[PDB]
Structure 1
Amino acid sequence: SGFRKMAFPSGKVEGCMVQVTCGTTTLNGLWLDDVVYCPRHVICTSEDMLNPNYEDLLIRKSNHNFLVQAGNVQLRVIGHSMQNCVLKLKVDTANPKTPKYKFVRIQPGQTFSVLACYNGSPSGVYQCAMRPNFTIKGSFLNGSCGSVGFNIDYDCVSFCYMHHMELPTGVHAGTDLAGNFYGPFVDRQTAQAAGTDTTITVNVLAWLYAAVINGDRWFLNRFTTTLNDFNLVAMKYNYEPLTQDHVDILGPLSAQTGIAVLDMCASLKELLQNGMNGRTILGSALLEDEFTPFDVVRQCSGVTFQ
């Protein structure tokens, strides 16, 4: 028992991190087969930054303008190309540590692990969610761009995130591995705002089930509700709407605890309306929303990875 913000083991991803340096700029790259993926703004100088044209900046570049370093080994860049906001540096050496992977694009509400890196070296790993406003609440300093987010499926690393930028509420924006930003953000040093966030309701309910599974029951209740009356409460408290597929996805947790989804909704309603009365759930005095239903089942059933 117990419930922790648990990341995926990071070893298959650590073997893919390299350092990419162009001019006066260093960041991280992801080296899969004979391609290094990294944020295209590596080609940017500090004055290019306010409104760059990357197409013009890239055609100005030669393969030798890119220092790609895999620890204390320099990879020779033998080609390059830009796909949306990511650079793809073809190198003459395929990564012998390449795991089974794919590139996936995740949905808001979905979670992933981030392997925060600087100079191609892993600094730490932590669990994130794609917020409904397509930001993530990460921990990223200068140098961290090109660090990636990922999930694992038995042996397969699903890369879903590459870090690009920090917005002024201290939240973070990035792309999938095809270079397309999550949300309306662009890789420009121009004023941009995240927009109002909402709480991921299906994740809160999943975390309440996690709580019951670990014997934390003080919040439940006799009552039930309908999907419609619950969702009218979600409106008031800036919770995202609960769908039937959300209900359907909570079924397994519902079946293991014997608490109907709509009963858990009734408990969430009373928590929303009255607060927690100085109590905690799973060690938090806030309703936690970056655990998906799968996160809860994985952690409470001990799914492993090879």
Structure 2
Amino acid sequence: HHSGLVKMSHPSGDVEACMVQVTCGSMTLNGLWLDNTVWCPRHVMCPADQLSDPNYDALLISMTNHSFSVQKHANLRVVGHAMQGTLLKLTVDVANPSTPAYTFTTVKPGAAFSVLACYNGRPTGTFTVVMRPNYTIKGSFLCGSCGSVGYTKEGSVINFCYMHQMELANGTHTGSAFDGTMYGAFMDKQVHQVQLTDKYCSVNVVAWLYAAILNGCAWFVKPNRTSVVSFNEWALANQFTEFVGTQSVDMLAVKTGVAIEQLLYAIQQLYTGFQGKQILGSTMLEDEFTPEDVNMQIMGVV
């Protein structure tokens, strides 16, 4: 029996109209064109021989307005340039006529956002990822994908929350919010960097367990319960994130009739082992589906 839950991404049509190609010499990457501002990663100014330890402040001074080439596949003239954190704020004389209503937001661990993978300013694919506790994402990025944007949608408004910058040794990816800060303690330098541990997202495992109950799979549900405070103490010693309930989780509890503390106890015993049984066709706990995903995809509640 299929759960009805898939990795669902937002429609990308609004964001594809904001994708441009930015070249600052020998390096090309993607940029976000909103109004008269083009955002792009700041290592576009970096020559290939200084990626390991670049001085962006000196490089920015070395740049002029005619040093950035912006193209849409239309060529955009740069009338101003500035750097905020690990991002470049290039000003252009033409405002994007297809600029959507948008905000800039920071995404937190356990939350899901949609990614538009682009190369040479041309959208290539879309996928959804969950920001992991170590502030990395398990995405699909290759050379030239920097500048690809991550976004969430609340109505007609697109909340941009991620710009791809680098890939780690473990194969995961990290980037920067549109305030210039890289997620976690990461730096936009081509060096090996210490990566924090990854943890199971408790609020997403609880949602995934609720989805099984909404699909008739409730063998793991027992009348025993574990409080949030006790579970969070247990989570700290078992590579699980501390659980914080939300209204979305409460809706799932109300509809199913199963308490959160019942599932918290279940996660503790399911962590020790599924014992040859399966939940939604899996033998491991899944934290890649948010409570809002289960609310939306299965019950049509947004």
User: What is the TM-score with the length of structure 2 in the denominator?
Assistant: 0.94
**Contact between 2:27 and 2:44, CA under 8 Å: does it hold in 1?**
yes
- Contact 1:167–1:193 under 8 Å retained in 2: no
**In 2, Cα distance between the equivalents of 1:278 and 1:96?**
56
Report if aligned partners of 1:29, 1:146 keep a CA contact under 8 Å in 2.
yes
Match of 1:296 in 2: 294
2:271 matched residue in structure 1: 272
Offset at residue 223 of structure 1 (A): 2.1
- Contact (CA 8 Å) 2:4, 2:297: kept in 1 or not? no
The one-letter code matched in structure 2 to 1:3 is L
Which amino acid in structure 1 is aligned with residue 118 of structure 2? C
1:20-53 CA-to-partner distances (Å, cap 9, x unmatched) read 1111101110000111100000100111212111
Using the alignment, how far apart are the partners of 1:281 and 1:122 within structure 2?
A: 36
Give the Cα separation in 1 of the matches to 2:264 and 2:120: 46
Indicate if the aligned counterparts of 1:28 and 1:38 stay in contact, CA closer than 8 A. yes
Tell me which of 2, 8, 15 is aligned to 2:4: 2
CA RMSD of aligned residues (A): 1.7
Q: Provide the C-alpha distance between the structure 2 equivalents of 1:13 and 1:240, rounded to a whole number of angstroms.
A: 32
1:94 and 1:68 map into 2 onto residues whose CA distance is 13
Provide the aligned length of Structure 1 versus Structure 2: 300
Alignment of 1:247-262 (within 5 A): 250-262=249-261
Give distance in 1, aligned partners of 2:286 and 2:137.
15
The 8 Å contact of residues 49 and 189 in structure 1, kept in 2 or not, is answered as yes
Equivalent in the alignment of 2:148: 147
Task: Report percent identity of matched pairs.
Answer: 51
Q: Is the 8 A contact 2:115 2:151 kept in 1?
A: yes
Deviation of 1:58 after TM superposition, in Å, equals 1.0
Whether 2:20 is the aligned partner of 1:22: answer no
Secondary structure in structure 2 of the residue aligned to 1:50? coil
- The 2-side partners of 1:124 and 1:219 are apart by 37
State the 1:141 CA deviation: 0.3
For residue 160 of structure 1, what is the aligned residue in structure 2?
161
Once the two structures are TM-superposed, the CA of residue 302 in structure 1 deviates from its matched residue by 3.0
When residues 202 and 77 of structure 1 are mapped into structure 2, their CA distance, relative to the original with a 3 A threshold, is same
Deviations, residues 140-184 of structure 1 (Å, cap 9, x unaligned): 000000101111011000000001001111111110012111111
- The answer to whether the Cα contact below 8 Å between 1:203 and 1:291 also exists between their aligned partners in 2 is yes
Cα gap change, 1:130 to 1:242, in 2 (>3 Å): same
CA distance in 2, matches of 1:272, 1:247: 23
Contact between 1:3 and 1:214, CA under 8 Å: does it hold in 2? no
Secondary structure of 1:47's counterpart equals helix
Q: What letter matches 1:175 in structure 2? A: S
Q: Kindly report structure 1 stretches of 4+ aligned residues shifted beyond 4 Å.
A: none
What secondary structure does 1:3 align onto?
Answer: coil
Query: How many Å apart are 1:220 and its aligned residue?
Result: 1.9
Quote the offset at 1:5 in angstroms: 1.2
Q: Letter of the aligned partner of 2:133 in structure 1? A: P
Matching residue of 1:64: 66
Could you state the TM-score of these two structures normalised by the residue count of structure 1? 0.93
Paired with 2:197 and 2:44, the residues of 1 have a C-alpha distance of 30
Question: Is it true that 1:133 corresponds to 2:134 in the alignment?
Answer: yes
Tell me if structure 2 keeps the 8 A contact 1:168–1:193: no
DSSP 3-state at the match of 1:254: helix
- The code of the aligned residue for 1:230 comes to F
Equivalent residues in 2 for 1:140-219, closer than 5 Å: 140-219=141-220
> Is 2:14 aligned against 1:12?
yes
Q: Which structure 2 residue ranges, 5 or more long, are not aligned?
A: none
Deviations 1:176-229 (A, max 9, x none): 012111111111112202121111111110111122112222322232222233
Alignment-mate amino acid for residue 78 of structure 2: V
Deviating more after overlay: 276-285 vs 208-217: 276-285
SS in 1 for 2:51: helix
Moved more, 222-231 or 181-190: 222-231
Higher mean C-alpha deviation, range 284-293 or range 115-124 = 284-293
Map 1:82-101 → 2, pairs under 5 A: 82-101=83-102
Tell whether the 8 Å contact from 2:9 to 2:127 is kept in structure 1 after alignment: yes
* Residues 215 and 253 (structure 1), Cα distance of their counterparts in 2 relative to 1, 3 Å cut: same
